[PDB]
Ligand binder design. Structure first.
Ligand code: ZN
Length: 489
């Protein structure tokens, strides 16, 4: 039989759209008029008639029952995040807020005065007066790794991501402190921050794996640690849990899921300290990146991540661009779509699976050429839908000329045009080139009618509902990832 440790096990995709007032927790549907639209072209399209547009908050994704760390690493780098076991992203074209995937590391990090102050006070809180610093440290990372292990009052401990009452009670206090009373029940805390879709080896590990990880301050250059998957890092002050960091270990680095701290410890600045400690952790274990999740330029609860610097995923081009290079042109909630200035004006969405962009050469934001009210994407996708109907895909054309909800619901229907999803024109190419038949003998279905797995053998002969579900999965994660998928229908 089959090796489930190389499988991505997922539900069928969902496209969930609703009024941003109240579904969006970043803007609650309240946008200044200069930030309401994804591009100048769309603001012009509604110039002076902005009321009729009712901002939507929109996500697309799937639940997973199993994903290994390498596959989760690929999803992160496709623009997804996990919320518990649900893998999701926003519809960057229609969403109220423009969410960008961001990663950084110690090479990008500019140690500002604000950040150095947070470390000096952290050191002063945990360090004995007998501690003797070196006259110089190469890096702030080497300074941290000298004094932190020597504190007799402060201990950070990595451990499996398991519920405890103590962790939950701290969570309740913090969520109340930040006024995030999302019912915060025990079950919800467990699902959000303890239960994960990773393998049992990745969740539970071994005693030696945790021991090696917890010795991270002592790693020397070129040394590596075996840990992948989820972890809790517990911060103790004289035995008292004062903070909890929920972290995913990936081959390419560390992803920060959530961070909580005891509100009575406001003057330890634990929010800044923990991100710096994690940036140091990434460096010490010799991995390239620290992932803070989603960056929203106009939302204070998320734009703090810019202080750690780094680069932003261009989902359309599947490449990162340094935030410093584009910060100026996304500070009004714009969708950015890169295009080298030398390249001709494109008459289509950018091709994913096929002259890749180079952000060191000059480039411009081509969002209105492709996805604007007069862009090519919509017509290109309408023609593509008709071509795909001939293969049995149950897509329908999006004939409303505007992408926004105007003021005078099938959760399995994805819009024809979503940035970062495989363009329907490219899906047509997969069918026409025969590439779709590589799904045969590779993609697997879990059939809940029969409570049984089966390997797809002749994909094009499957029922239209099944071919449609699989094709939407391909839109989301690409053909090669879908080939190792088990999809629950
Ligand atoms: Zn919003």
């Amino acid at each position: 039989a089959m090796d489930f440790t190389d499988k991505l096990i997922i539900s069928r995709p969902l496209y969930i759209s609703d009024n941003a007032d109240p579904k969006c927790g970043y803007c609650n549907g309240k946008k200044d008029s200069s930030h309401k639209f994804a591009s100048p072209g769309w603001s012009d399209f509604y110039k002076g008639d902005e009321d009729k547009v009712e901002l939507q908050s929109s996500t697309v994704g799937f639940n997973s029952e199993l994903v290994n760390a390498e596959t989760y690493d690929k999803l992160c780098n496709l623009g997804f995040r996990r919320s518990g076991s649900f893998m999701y992203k926003t519809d960057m074209l229609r969403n109220c807020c423009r969410l960008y995937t961001i990663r950084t590391n110690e090479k990008y990090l500019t140690m500002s005065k604000e950040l150095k102050t947070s470390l000096k006070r952290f050191k002063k809180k945990i360090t004995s007066p007998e501690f003797k610093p070196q006259p110089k440290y190469v890096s702030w990372i080497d300074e941290l790794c000298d004094y932190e292990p020597k504190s007799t009052s402060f201990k950070a401990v990595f451990e499996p991501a398991e519920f405890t009452d103590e962790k939950y009670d701290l969570y309740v206090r913090y969520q109340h402190y930040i006024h995030s009373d999302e019912d915060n029940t025990p079950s919800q805390f467990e699902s959000f921050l303890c239960d994960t879709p990773f393998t049992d080896s990745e969740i539970t590990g071994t005693e030696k794996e945790w021991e090696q990880l917890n010795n991270w301050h002592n790693l020397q250059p070129g040394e590596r640690v075996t840990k992948n998957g989820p972890a809790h890092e517990c911060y103790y002050h004289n035995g008292k849990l004062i903070a909890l960091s929920v972290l995913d270990f990936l081959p390419s680095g560390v992803s920060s899921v959530y961070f909580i701290w005891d509100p009575d410890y406001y003057d330890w600045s634990l929010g800044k300290v923990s991100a710096l400690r994690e940036l140091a952790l990434v460096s010490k274990i010799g991995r390239p990146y620290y992932y803070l999740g989603y960056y929203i330029d106009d939302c204070p609860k998320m734009n703090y991540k810019a202080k750690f610097g780094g680069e932003i995923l261009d989902v359309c081009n599947q490449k990162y661009v340094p935030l410093s290079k584009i910060h100026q042109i996304i500070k009004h909630n714009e969708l950015f779509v890169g295009l080298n200035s030398t390249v001709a004006s494109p008459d289509s969405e950018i091709l994913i699976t096929s002259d890749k962009i180079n952000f060191d050469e000059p480039f411009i934001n081509a969002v209105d050429d492709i996805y604007g009210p007069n862009g090519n994407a919509s017509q290109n996708a309408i023609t593509s839908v008709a071509k795909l109907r001939k293969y049995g895909i149950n897509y329908s054309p999006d004939l409303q000329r505007s992408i926004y909800k105007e003021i005078p619901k099938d959760v399995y229907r994805i819009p024809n045009v979503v940035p970062g999803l495989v363009p329907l024109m490219e899906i047509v190419s997969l069918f026409e080139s025969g590439k779709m038949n590589e799904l045969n003998n590779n993609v697997v279905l879990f059939d809940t009618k029969i409570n049984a797995l089966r390997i797809v053998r002749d994909f094009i002969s499957e029922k239209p509902e099944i071919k449609t579900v699989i094709t939407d999965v391909i839109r989301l994660i690409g053909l090669d990832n879908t080939k190792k998928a088990i999809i629950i229908i």
